[PDB]
């Protein structure tokens, strides 16, 4: 690298010393790609190594084998793991890719070209070459459209991915006739983020998910061709600040936004995040409390439709804020729940008490592992459930853990966005290093009073 | 630029000549915060009793319904709501909207937007005055704390009713039930936050003392020691080398804070990062990760449960959970 | 105590964001000189800001 | 009803220090 006195930046700002060195930027970036792929491959190897096949696969502290299993790679009808070789081969391919990526990264950091445009005009860039920035965006957006269409190929032509909503308790299903229509996809993206609908955590079916992936892949590919074949407009070039620091701020704000989104995804979804592979979400295990208790006391002999609780609303059933009958526990805040074992028990108008009395199914009944243990409690130091629960079980819900890690780190990335937003705006103005000490804006404008 | 209505409007909005700089963040900060202030004042004065728990058994929390200010509070929404977005137009009447808990949603949503736009307004004035922009970055810690206790915790627990009520006795109640069901006091982020607030007070007193002692004599025991010279000269007062000399002689004179910029950066970064961490601890327990659960941790050779300070805290926490929601539980485990 | 933590954070941040130019390197900490008798921060700018 | 002792205590704790601070302010501004 280089020193402070010539770069102007201290060691704790040294990664900015390579702002104007595109080759070193490439070296650091390819090395980072190696780091990410290396962690992915390593963790997939561990989650293969620490596997107990007879138990349900969420109590072993495994976060990304659910990522492979959501693709249906070795998943039984009810959700049985069956085989671990796809997870193993995924981890090893990631590790080899990590080795080649890391070698390329260290090569471009050390012996790679120090500056790129003198030999490769296709790879060199000053940070005001707005046309070539748009070209780079076009390339990356084409890549993202290719990845989305890859998920399309898996869902429609490779016979994979698990649907939790198949009858009997779900099934790995090759998706036929996905819903790609603009009305449902855009209404899915422009609705409220609260419990009435949920903005982006509202996708109840994988035809809707895959149709959204149709839309995102097509849009990214067409916008990639657009960004390749167009030039920034005067309004964009006036409203935006164009520097490598402002680009960091835009990327940081965006990645914080999708980090917050991914946190909420992990916390609430049971469709794109199967509960059978992740553990229950917030509203479930509490819906499971109410469901197990209702079936148990209607089994003993006590009625539940005429059963009234301590507060006048119902110990086992009440009416929702809307005119539908919902479960009577304290899970009445979670009346908007949709999990694979309630729709066969869901009636149009009400909960269909005669269906509850007679048409109960034993898969629904045996869906009590979500109830008894595994609720999204779990403490910082494992232990059992609530903060008073004692050292009896070793469990924490991966939904909780990769929700809180993601939202915390997304908040820190929001802070980083704020930092580089302000510094980029101030540097493009000209006072990143302070006020000029002789002609301040303060002395040039009027006093307040 | 002068005969154009929008140009006039822009040069008045972005004008730094105003008493309060408003800007484009201010045109969205002022209405939300003023709306929240208005409804908060009116609700704190004459709010009809609101059912927080969804059990048709309301709390009053308002002065005209028979309580003082510290025991009165703007109470969170009903447990029937949850995170269900209940504003006035979702109610057939203002009266039913008030009983259900809508003013809490209105004040919290508007306060969230107003605080973020206050963040932006502060950055905007920093930009228009030619400064460095990190006042908003330092302000990010109370903003993070406010979002953690007003938005993040309702999202994590699935109901705005579990959010922090706007009050003092309500603050204590939310704080204690938070202890009961999450054990914040045994969490490393909360210990960092407590260490940071105690250290922030420590560094405030330390810096204040070291630089009010380092006074070259320009203000005597009279209003000022102007006898040397009156107001209107660039001959600067105070001292900063002697303060670092005193701090060095204080303990070991090797962790030098000689640079005033380094010293003020340290005083800025320590409480800000610690309040960041304790707000994130609140955020972790929003997604219900709790703190340390050190109960049943010490055993003897025969395996007997050997009592511990952690077990004392555990029995206190469960004695806290037994009165938590006396009648709103129908079922044994507390998950919803 | 909360007001003291408030004052510590706000004072440190205000001084750090009013630190003048005082050099050509972007590392502003080295831009400070213990020998110089000038204020390290623009208290006029800080006062009008708050 | 009505806590007259508390009413008197609160009323004087308002008025007497308030009148004190205001009188020193107006006498300071009278002779700068």
């Amino acid at each position: 690298g280089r020193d402070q006195e010539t770069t102007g930046f201290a060691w704790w700002a040294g990664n900015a010393r390579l702002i104007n060195l595109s080759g070193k930027l490439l070296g650091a970036h390819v090395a980072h790609a190696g780091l990410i792929v290396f962690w992915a491959g390593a963790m997939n190897l561990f989650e293969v190594s620490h596997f107990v096949p007879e138990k349900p696969m969420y109590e072993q502290g495994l976060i990304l084998l659910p990522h492979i299993a959501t693709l249906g790679y070795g998943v039984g009808p009810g959700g049985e793991v069956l085989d671990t070789f796809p997870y193993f081969v995924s981890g090893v391919l990631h590790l080899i890719s990590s080795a080649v990526l890391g070698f390329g990264g260290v090569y471009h950091s050390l012996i790679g070209p120090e500056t790129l445009e003198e030999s490769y005009p296709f790879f060199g860039y000053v940070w005001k070459d707005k046309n070539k920035m748009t070209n780079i965006l076009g390339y990356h957006l084409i890549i993202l459209g290719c990845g989305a269409w890859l998920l399309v190929l898996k869902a429609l032509y490779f016979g994979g991915v698990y649907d939790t909503w198949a009858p009997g308790g779900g099934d790995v299903r090759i998706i036929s006739n996905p819903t790609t229509n603009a009305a449902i996809i855009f209404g899915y993206i422009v609705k409220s983020p609260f419990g009435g609908d949920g903005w982006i955590v509202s996708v109840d079916n994988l035809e809707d998910i895959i149709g959204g992936h149709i839309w995102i892949g097509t849009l990214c590919i067409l916008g990639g061709i657009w960004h390749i074949y167009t030039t920034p407009w005067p309004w964009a070039r006036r409203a935006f600040v164009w520097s490598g620091e402002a680009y960091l701020s835009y990327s940081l704000a965006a990645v914080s936004l999708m980090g917050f989104t991914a946190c909420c995804f992990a916390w609430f979804n049971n469709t794109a995040y199967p509960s059978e592979f992740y553990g229950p979400t917030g509203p479930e295990a509490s819906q499971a409390q109410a469901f197990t208790f209702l079936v148990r006391d209607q089994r003993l002999g006590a009625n539940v439709a005429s059963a009234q609780g301590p507060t006048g609303l119902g110990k086992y059933l009440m009416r929702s804020p809307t005119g539908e009958i919902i479960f009577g526990g304290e899970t009445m805040r979670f009346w908007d729940f949709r999990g694979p074992w309630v729709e066969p028990l869901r009636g149009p108008s009400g909960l269909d008490l005669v269906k509850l009395k007679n048409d109960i199914q034993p898969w629904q009944e045996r869906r009590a592992a979500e109830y008894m243990t595994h609720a999204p409690l779990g403490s910082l130091n494992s232990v059992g459930g609530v903060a008073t629960e004692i050292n009896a079980v070793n469990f924490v819900s991966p939904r909780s853990w990769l929700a809180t890690s993601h939202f915390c780190l997304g908040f820190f990335f929001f802070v980083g966005h704020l930092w580089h937003a302000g510094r980029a705006r101030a540097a493009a103005a000209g006072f990143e290093k302070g006020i000029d000490r002789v002609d301040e804006p303060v002395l040039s404008m009027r006093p307040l009073d | 630029e002068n005969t154009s209505l929008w140009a006039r409007f822009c040069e008045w909005i972005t004008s730094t000549e105003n008493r309060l700089y408003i800007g484009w963040f201010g045109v969205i900060m002022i209405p939300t915060l003023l709306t929240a202030i208005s409804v908060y004042i009116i609700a704190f004065i004459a709010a009809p009793p609101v059912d927080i728990d969804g059990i048709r058994e309301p709390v009053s929390g308002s002065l005209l319904y028979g309580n003082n200010i510290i025991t009165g509070a703007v109470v969170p929404t009903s447990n029937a709501i949850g995170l269900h977005f209940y504003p006035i137009w979702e109610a057939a009447s203002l009266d039913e909207w008030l009983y259900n808990g809508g003013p809490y949603q209105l004040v919290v949503c508007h306060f969230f937007l107003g605080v973020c736009c206050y963040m932006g307004r502060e950055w905007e004035l920093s930009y228009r005055l030619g400064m460095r922009p990190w006042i908003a970055v330092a302000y990010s810690a109370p903003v993070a704390a406010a979002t953690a206790v007003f938005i993040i915790y309702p999202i994590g627990q699935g109901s705005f009713s579990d959010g922090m009520p706007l009050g003092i006795s309500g603050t204590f109640n939310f704080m204690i039930v938070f202890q009961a069901e999450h054990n914040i006091l045994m969490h490393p982020f909360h210990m960092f936050g407590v260490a940071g607030v105690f250290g922030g007070s420590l560094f405030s007193a330390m810096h204040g003392s070291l630089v009010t002692s380092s006074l070259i004599r320009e203000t005597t025991e009279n209003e000022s020691a102007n006898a040397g010279y009156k107001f209107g000269q660039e001959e600067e007062t105070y001292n900063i080398v002697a303060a670092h000399g005193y701090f060095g002689r204080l303990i070991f004179q090797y962790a030098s804070f000689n640079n005033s910029r380094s010293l003020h950066f340290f005083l800025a970064v320590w409480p800000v990062v610690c309040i960041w961490l304790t707000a994130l601890g609140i955020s972790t327990m929003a997604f219900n990760l709790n703190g340390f659960n050190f109960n049943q941790s010490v055993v003897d050779s025969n395996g007997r449960v050997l009592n511990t300070w952690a077990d004392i805290i555990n029995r206190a926490n469960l004695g806290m959970e037994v009165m938590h929601e006396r009648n709103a539980h129908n079922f044994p485990l507390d998950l919803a | 105590v909360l007001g003291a933590a408030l004052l510590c954070a706000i004072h440190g941040a205000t001084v750090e964001n009013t630190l003048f130019e005082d050099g050509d390197g972007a590392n502003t900490f080295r831009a400070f000189n213990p020998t110089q008798a000038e204020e390290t921060y623009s208290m006029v700018t800080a006062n009008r800001f708050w | 009803e009505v806590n007259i002792l508390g009413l008197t205590a609160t009323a004087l704790f308002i008025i007497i220090p308030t009148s004190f601070l205001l009188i020193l302010y107006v006498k300071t501004a009278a002779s700068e």
């Binding site: 006093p447 307040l448 009073d449 | 008493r19 004065i45 002065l63 005209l64 003082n68 200010i69 107001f231 | 208290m43 006029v44 006062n47 | 009505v2 806590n3 009413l7 609160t10 308002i14």
Partner: peptide
């Protein structure tokens, strides 16, 4: 009489804050 006492002290302190914000002494020496 209880409630109007609290109301008066609260709005009075808010009034002193308003008066100190907009009708303060103009700042001197920096």
């Amino acid at each position: 009489m209880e409630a109007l006492v609290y109301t008066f002290l609260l709005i009075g302190t808010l009034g002193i804050i308003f008066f100190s914000i907009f009708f303060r002494e103009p700042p001197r020496i920096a």
